[PDB]
Design a protein around this ligand. Structure first.
Ligand SMILES: COc1nc(C(=O)NCC(=O)O)c(O)c2ccc(Oc3ccc(Cc4ccccc4)cc3)cc12
Lengths: 11, 230
């Protein structure tokens, strides 16, 4: 959940 | 009226640059501008929000202060401020002539279009905010600093580093007020009026998130990054 936000955040 | 200290000129440089690098078609959004012609108006709207969200993420990541926070805080802050910032970025591009805002730096929409797109009353709020901001003549720096203030909101629920985020907000608010002192806008009580625009953007943020909870329309019709930041 927020799996894509977390992807874009880490880099 | 105190003006920016050396370190505030530096923070102003940083936050302005983060904004300019992630703001769609910076200062060439009006000549490169198209106009548009129901869950079909919503369809045209959902296929174009994803890059607007992506730019807000990109802006946050160019703030070292933001990058120092733990990922769970970073996610919460972005959820809180994403529609507030896309809304500010759209409102500062209000064209009084065509009575449009600009999305993704090329798409002009009217009050009626945004409303039919499913924003409801939030559409009227974003347009009234845009009309009232024409006389404010906000530059890249003032827009970037409003954005940083909205991002560093210590009061979003479930944050771990409430205190640290609060200190970042305070640094931005002081530099921002000092920059405002320096710019000597021809508008009485400028800084108090700007704090009220922050409040307007926060109500747009809280009404946006409220409206999303009310529009269960199957969720799959909505793009993933848009159902994440609500
Ligand atoms: C203020 O909004 C927006 N701003 C910008 C912007 O200016 N970006 C910054 C920059 O240009 O630099 C955009 O590009 C946008 C692109 C698509 C967009 O689509 C919609 C349309 C309708 C809804 C209805 C809704 C409401 C609540 C809950 C569920 C559904 C949702 C999303 C809204 C945008």
């Amino acid at each position: 959940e927020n799996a894509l936000l977390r992807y874009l955040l880490d880099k | 009226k105190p003006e920016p200290t050396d370190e505030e000129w530096e923070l102003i440089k940083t936050v302005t640059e983060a904004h300019v690098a992630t703001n769609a078609q910076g200062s060439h959004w009006k000549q490169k501008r198209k106009f548009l012609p129901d869950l079909e108006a919503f369809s045209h709207f959902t296929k174009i929000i994803t890059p607007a969200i992506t730019r807000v993420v990109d802006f946050a990541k160019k703030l070292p202060m933001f990058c120092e926070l733990p990922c769970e805080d970073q996610i919460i802050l972005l959820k809180g401020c994403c529609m507030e910032i896309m809304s500010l970025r759209a409102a500062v591009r209000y064209d009084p002539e065509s009575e449009t805002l600009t999305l993704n730096g090329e798409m002009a929409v009217t009050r009626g279009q945004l409303k039919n797109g499913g924003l409801g009353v939030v559409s009227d709020a974003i347009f009234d905010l845009g009309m009232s901001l024409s006389s404010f003549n906000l530059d890249d720096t003032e827009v970037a600093l409003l954005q940083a203030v909205l991002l560093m909101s210590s009061d979003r629920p479930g944050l771990a580093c409430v205190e640290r985020i609060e200190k970042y907000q305070d640094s931005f608010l002081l530099a921002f007020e000092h920059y405002i002192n320096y710019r000597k806008h021809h508008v009485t009580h400028f800084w108090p009026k700007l704090l009220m625009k922050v409040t307007d953007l926060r109500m747009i943020g809280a009404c946006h998130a409220s409206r999303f909870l009310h529009m269960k329309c199957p969720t799959e019709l909505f793009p993933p990054l848009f159902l994440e930041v609500f």
